[PDB]
């Protein structure tokens, strides 16, 4: 995944939601700081739902690959929102970013 058009993509599809960087405020979606090499149950004190706690799964592109085109999927008590990114092009360059930005 190209991790320019990763950021991109992030900024055009998730950013007034998640931030993925240090500083990232908690609004709706979590801060993903960190999100490659934790499992799901483990936010950093952001009110979680019996969705994401129940999943105890690892994210590292995999497991985020069908969940981003298949959120209500995974588990039907999430939030549900459109169908996925675009195809799996944009979603892997999405990832390449991600691995870097939530990292750092
Ligand atoms: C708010 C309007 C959101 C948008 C837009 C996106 N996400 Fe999200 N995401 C949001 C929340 C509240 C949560 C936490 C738990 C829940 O069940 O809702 C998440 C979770 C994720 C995860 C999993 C992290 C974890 O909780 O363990 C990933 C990998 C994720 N979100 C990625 C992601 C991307 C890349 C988005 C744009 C394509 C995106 N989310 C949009 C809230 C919101």
Redesign the pocket.
């Given at each position: 995944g190209d991790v320019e058009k990763g950021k991109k993509?992030?900024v055009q599809?998730?950013?007034?939601?998640?931030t993925?960087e240090k500083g990232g405020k908690h609004?709706?979606?979590?801060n993903?700081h960190g999100?490659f090499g934790?499992?799901?149950?483990?936010?950093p004190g952001?009110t979680?739902?019996d969705?994401?706690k129940n999943?105890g799964?690892t994210?590292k592109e995999e497991?985020?690959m069908e969940?981003?085109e298949n959120?209500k999927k995974y588990?039907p008590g999430?939030?549900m929102?459109?169908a996925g990114?675009k195809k799996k092009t944009e979603?892997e360059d999405?990832?390449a970013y991600?691995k870097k930005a939530t990292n750092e």
């Open positions: 993509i992030f599809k998730c950013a007034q939601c998640h993925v609004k709706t979606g979590p993903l999100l934790r499992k799901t149950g483990q936010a952001f979680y739902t969705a994401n999943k799964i994210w497991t985020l969940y981003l959120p588990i999430t939030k929102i459109f990114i979603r999405l990832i991600l």
